[PDB]
Amino acid sequence: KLQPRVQPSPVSGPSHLFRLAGKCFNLVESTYKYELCPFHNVTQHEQTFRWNAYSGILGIWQEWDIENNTFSGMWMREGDSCGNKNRQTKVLLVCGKANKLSSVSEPSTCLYSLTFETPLVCHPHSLLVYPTLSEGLQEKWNEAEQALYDELITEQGHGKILKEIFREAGYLKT
Amino acid sequence: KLQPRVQPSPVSGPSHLFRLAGKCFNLVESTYKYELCPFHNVTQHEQTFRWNAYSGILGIWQEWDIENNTFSGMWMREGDSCGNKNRQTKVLLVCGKANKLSSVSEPSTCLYSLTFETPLVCHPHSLLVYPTLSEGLQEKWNEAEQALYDELITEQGHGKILKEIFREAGYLKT
Ligand SMILES: *[C@@H]1O[C@H](CO)[C@@H](O[C@@H]2O[C@H](CO)[C@@H](O[C@@H]3O[C@H](CO[C@H]4O[C@H](CO[C@H]5O[C@H](CO)[C@@H](O)[C@H](O)[C@@H]5O[C@H]5O[C@H](CO)[C@@H](O)[C@H](O)[C@@H]5O)[C@@H](O)[C@H](O[C@H]5O[C@H](CO)[C@@H](O)[C@H](O)[C@@H]5O)[C@@H]4O)[C@@H](O)[C@H](O[C@H]4O[C@H](CO)[C@@H](O)[C@H](O)[C@@H]4O[C@H]4O[C@H](CO)[C@@H](O)[C@H](O)[C@@H]4O)[C@@H]3O)[C@H](O)[C@H]2NC(C)=O)[C@H](O)[C@H]1NC(C)=O
Ligand SMILES: *[C@@H]1O[C@H](CO)[C@@H](O[C@@H]2O[C@H](CO)[C@@H](O[C@@H]3O[C@H](CO[C@H]4O[C@H](CO)[C@@H](O)[C@H](O[C@H]5O[C@H](CO)[C@@H](O)[C@H](O)[C@@H]5O)[C@@H]4O)[C@@H](O)[C@H](O[C@H]4O[C@H](CO)[C@@H](O)[C@H](O)[C@@H]4O)[C@@H]3O)[C@H](O)[C@H]2NC(C)=O)[C@H](O)[C@H]1NC(C)=O
Numbered sequence A, B: 001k002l003q004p005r006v007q008p009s010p011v012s013g014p015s016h017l018f019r020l021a022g023k024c025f026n027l028v029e030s031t032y033k034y035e036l037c038p039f040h041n042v043t044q045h046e047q048t049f050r051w052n053a054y055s056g057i058l059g060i061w062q063e064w065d066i067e068n069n070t071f072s073g074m075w076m077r078e079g080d081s082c083g084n085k086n087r088q089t090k091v092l093l094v095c096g097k098a099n100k101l102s103s104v105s106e107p108s109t110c111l112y113s114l115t116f117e118t119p120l121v122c123h124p125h126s127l128l129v130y131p132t133l134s135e136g137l138q139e140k141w142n143e144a145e146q147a148l149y150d151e152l153i154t155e156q157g158h159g160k161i162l163k164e165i166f167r168e169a170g171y172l173k174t
């Protein structure tokens, strides 16, 4: 039984993925056992069966990772602390036959890359961020793409506008 | 007085395009004058303005042309008869500054390609067909893309499943 440091951000993004909120899937490795509760938290429970066996929170749903006009991954931040820093996790969404937690890795100590298989992402346009936006924020994007094509703004100024949109929608915390 | 052979199919597809229904735009060439009434009909009028001047129906809104997971064009069929066949028209939607009927051509006799400029299509992801589908038809599509990657169905069998999806949504006549 663990205490989270902050609460998860609101469920946001593609509508058809919202059904995953409140569900939890787990993967049992030899050393640890991980659980992913999408839009909420990630946790591991060391299965060495010694008395001080570790159980910690790796991250709390905070913001999205948007790269190349798509949802790159889900950012889980502000977990238990390793020392000077709090644990983080980037969940990656991959086409799979069924909702399954497939792998876990540790690129840097206390930073994790979690791969989540689900069939809801098998279509290429499922993780595009443009269809998820409100009718008004699409206009702001439409005007920015045309303005960039008309050479009224720079690729740099265009990049700024997109982050303004994503922040308003709540995909990036700010 | 012109009589359409059938009635135009229901308005279907992206929501932001529905506003064009009941509107009509025209292009005046030297020989003929064309009108496009989106989601309805297409017509040409020889402009000699004599009593026997030609007036014909080129097509009646029937179904979409979906290619590459997007809306390729609008299919207009069952126009006036040329002999063994009824006239057809494929309307193509292009990014333009304003709602404008831009061009008309006749690649093969009694088949026409009509180019309609509109600003509602200027964003690349505006005409994606996946977001317009019901949550269930999205599921049906995801499972079909997954089955194809697992080599349980053929690229040919995949195409048939998609036409079942598009037909169920109402984008294709049946
Ligand atoms: C391809 O697709 C195209 C797109 O869909 C399609 O085009 C559309 O076609 C449809 C079908 O034809 C059109 O819909 C109809 O439009 C008619 C035209 O309306 C306009 O003209 C009317 C003027 O009629 C007269 O009366 C006025 C006052 O009474 C006079 O001021 C006028 O000068 C005019 O007088 C003439 O007629 C008199 C007697 O008729 C005669 O004495 C006089 O001397 C002179 O000859 C206006 O009422 C009308 O105005 C309204 O709409 C405009 C829109 O801009 C507004 O600006 C106005 O403020 C106003 O709101 C237009 O100027 C309509 O008449 C017709 O209406 C009737 O039918 C519907 C359903 O059937 C009824 O619900 C409705 O109440 C009307 O009913 C009348 O007739 C029935 C019997 O017919 C009767 O029982 C009932 O009581 C009533 O009298 C309908 O809306 C549509 O407009 C087209 N749109 C476009 C963009 O083109 C095209 O056809 C397709 N082609 C093919 C080949 O498929
Ligand atoms: C990480 O994130 C995950 C998910 O985001 C968290 O997991 C969830 O934690 C909550 C607690 O905050 C759990 O809810 C409680 O559940 C208990 C027990 O019920 C459950 O287990 C039963 C086992 O058979 C099952 O029958 C229950 O089924 C019912 O409930 C579910 C949904 O709640 C519903 O879908 C079913 O149809 C049934 O209706 C259920 O699975 C329950 O008793 C609690 O309810 C009451 O009591 C508490 C305290 O008295 C009160 O506060 C409540 O408001 C309510 O009145 C409570 O709902 C939830 O089950 C967990 N889900 C999973 C998958 O584990 C996890 O806590 C987070 N951890 C950290 C560290 O952040």
Ligand SMILES: [Cl-]
Binding pocket: A013, A014, A015, A016, A131, A132, B131
């Ligand atoms: Cl969506």
Ligand SMILES: [Cl-]
Binding pocket: A011, A018, A019, A021
């Ligand atoms: Cl929800």
Ligand SMILES: [Cl-]
Binding pocket: A068, A069
């Ligand atoms: Cl892209």
Ligand SMILES: [Cl-]
Binding pocket: A081, A082
């Ligand atoms: Cl520690």
Ligand SMILES: [Cl-]
Binding pocket: A142, A143, A146, A147
């Ligand atoms: Cl603009």
Ligand SMILES: [Cl-]
Binding pocket: A009, A010, A062, A170, A171, A172, A173, A174
């Ligand atoms: Cl936020």
Ligand SMILES: [Cl-]
Binding pocket: B035
């Ligand atoms: Cl006319």
Ligand SMILES: [Cl-]
Binding pocket: none
């Ligand atoms: Cl054909």
Ligand SMILES: [Cl-]
Binding pocket: B149, B150, B151
């Ligand atoms: Cl394979």
Ligand SMILES: [Cl-]
Binding pocket: none
């Ligand atoms: Cl393919």
